[PDB]
Ligand binder design. Structure first.
Ligand code: UEO
Length: 256
């Protein structure tokens, strides 16, 4: 049920190369748009991924990039997903032509928060949430991509990691919460690199001294309060995604 026949795939355009390999646009059975992730040989714990792919295919949410299936009876193996016409969110934010209103930026945050609240309810961690791992469809909807995929990569996201990850490798729902706050910052900074004047090593040292990302000028005071709550020193004092969604909806109503 998780296996797609590669003979049903028509490769049409190269979209670019990502963290796991080249990505191409194509058609399934000459009809349906798909993205084809070609996993470069030797780069992935493939046996482990196949078994988790069966779990990932039961995760269905409108704001999760849908896994259609995999091709593993050959090499290199393929991951077949929903095609997102406007590409990755990081590049989308950096296209200044869009001249985003802040209501649009907030809607991007809400889209991701809904997907993350869904994964939280399923006790599934993303483990590498960032704007590079979010995608935008033709209607401008943002969806979360490649959730959990870093577990099978055989360059660590320091700038999206809370102190207990940098210090102790302590992963939890709350390290996803922290990363979400950084993602809100990426969105409202129109895709700047977090801690844009620091190296990873300096970021870690400054994070330990209590430094935090400044308020992007496009975020209102209430929006900065939301992203800032994701960065509490003590992980247990960080909200859940259900709480963040209620907070995002509250601000959306106030700034409508
Ligand atoms: C931020 C990361 C990044 O830039 N890349 C390189 C490119 C491939 C990208 O993946 C997809 N890219 C597009 C796309 C790219 N350009 N246009 C017009 C659409 C669509 N879909 N639909 C499912 C997946 C992808 C991820 C990695």
């Amino acid at each position: 049920s998780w296996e797609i026949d590669p003979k049903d795939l028509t490769f049409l355009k190269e979209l670019g190369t990502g963290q796991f390999g080249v990505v191409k646009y194509g058609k399934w059975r000459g009809q349906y748009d798909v993205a084809i992730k070609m996993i470069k040989e030797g780069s992935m714990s493939e046996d482990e991924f196949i078994e988790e792919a069966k779990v990932m295919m039961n995760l269905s949410h409108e704001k999760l990039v849908q896994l259609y299936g995999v091709c593993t009876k050959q090499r290199p193996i393929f991951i077949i997903t929903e095609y997102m016409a406007n590409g990755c969110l990081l590049n989308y934010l950096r296209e200044m032509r869009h001249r985003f209103q802040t209501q649009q930026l907030l809607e991007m945050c809400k889209d991701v928060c809904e997907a993350m609240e869904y994964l939280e309810s399923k006790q599934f961690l993303h483990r590498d949430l960032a704007a590079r791992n979010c995608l935008v469809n033709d209607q401008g909807v943002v969806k979360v991509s490649d959730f959990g995929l870093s577990r099978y990569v055989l360059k660590f996201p320091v700038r999206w990691s809370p102190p207990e990850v940098l210090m102790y490798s302590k992963f939890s729902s709350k390290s996803d919460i922290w990363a979400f706050g950084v993602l809100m910052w990426e969105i409202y900074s129109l895709g700047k690199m977090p801690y844009e004047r620091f190296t990873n090593s300096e970021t870690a040292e400054h994070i330990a001294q209590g430094l935090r990302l400044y308020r992007p000028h496009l975020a209102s005071e209430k929006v900065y309060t939301i992203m800032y709550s994701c960065w509490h020193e003590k992980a247990d004092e960080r909200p859940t995604f259900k709480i963040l969604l209620s907070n995002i909806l509250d601000v959306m109503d106030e700034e409508s």
